[PDB]
Symmetry: C2
Subunit: 126 residues, 2 copies
């Protein structure tokens, strides 16, 4: 395993004010992000608080694994989980767009949220 | 059910004409290059990427495509392949598709969209591809 390194690998390829500005946009609009709209915050912050050390980070992978096995145990469609993902990436994209940060940093800021969430569901998918 | 087409054609609406084509082209010119293995555990992925990157705009084609994704899922399900191996494939796909786009001299705003389009495209296919 040590999908922790793996995780750092994809994290170390992102500049600092992006990491900060993406983190800071998850921790703000933290509670404003839980979306239910069709016919929780600690999570976003957990994933988007991203650091270096592999105690304060590991619990993130072990937690993700936990929270899938929750979802599967009670038997809920994974494509429902991955859709939630989507609307999340989406709302996060929308939140990124409406900033006055250069499109260059947006460019990273986009891959940074997209990789994370998908990584999440990947490892959340057990 | 059926409005899986509705959603896709709408999302495809959140994007400009060139980006769409740029991305279509991107996948298309490198369809033969992108089935790329570089790791450890255990011409098809061309027309898949192409099917799923034919920026298609027709409830008809969409349905079949949609349903294609569905059928692809079920096959992967019978053999009993872990969902998190496929999402992984999927992650590698857009990751290299990301990179391809980066190394193209486009307008970084054009670029942003280009990113969103490839991201949501695969993930949407992936979402549908789910049945097990
Ligand atoms: C991006 C996708 C999702 C994420 C990140 C997520 C996150 C979580 C987390 C972290 C928990 C932990 C609760 C705990 O530890 O006590 C949880 C529980 C739960 N989730 Fe979600 N969820 C997602 C999608 C969904 C969807 C689409 C549904 C639709 C019904 C759903 C329904 C539930 C339910 C019913 C529980 C209760 C489990 C319990 O008893 O603690 N989840 N979810
Ligand atoms: C994004 C990821 C993937 C996509 C889009 C994909 C797509 C496909 C497609 C289109 C087919 C043939 C269906 C047809 O056109 O008739 C196929 C077959 C197959 N795929 Fe993949 N695949 C993916 C990942 C994987 C992974 C990760 C594995 C295993 C680790 C895998 C194993 C197989 C196997 C074993 C078959 C043949 C099944 C049989 O002969 O019964 N695929 N896949």
């Amino acid at each position: 395993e040590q999908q922790a390194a793996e995780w750092k690998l994809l994290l170390g390829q992102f500049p600092a004010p992006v990491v900060a500005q993406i983190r800071e946009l998850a921790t703000t609009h933290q509670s404003e992000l839980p979306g239910y709209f069709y016919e929780l915050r600690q999570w976003i912050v957990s994933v988007f608080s991203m650091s270096d050390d592999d105690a304060a980070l590991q619990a993130l992978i072990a937690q993700q694994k936990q929270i899938g096995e929750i979802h599967a145990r009670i038997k809920i469609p994974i494509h429902l989980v991955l859709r939630g993902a989507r609307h999340l990436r989406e709302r996060l994209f929308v939140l990124l767009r409406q900033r006055p940060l250069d499109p260059e940093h947006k460019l990273f800021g986009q891959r940074l949220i997209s990789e994370t969430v998908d990584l999440a569901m990947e490892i959340m998918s057990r």
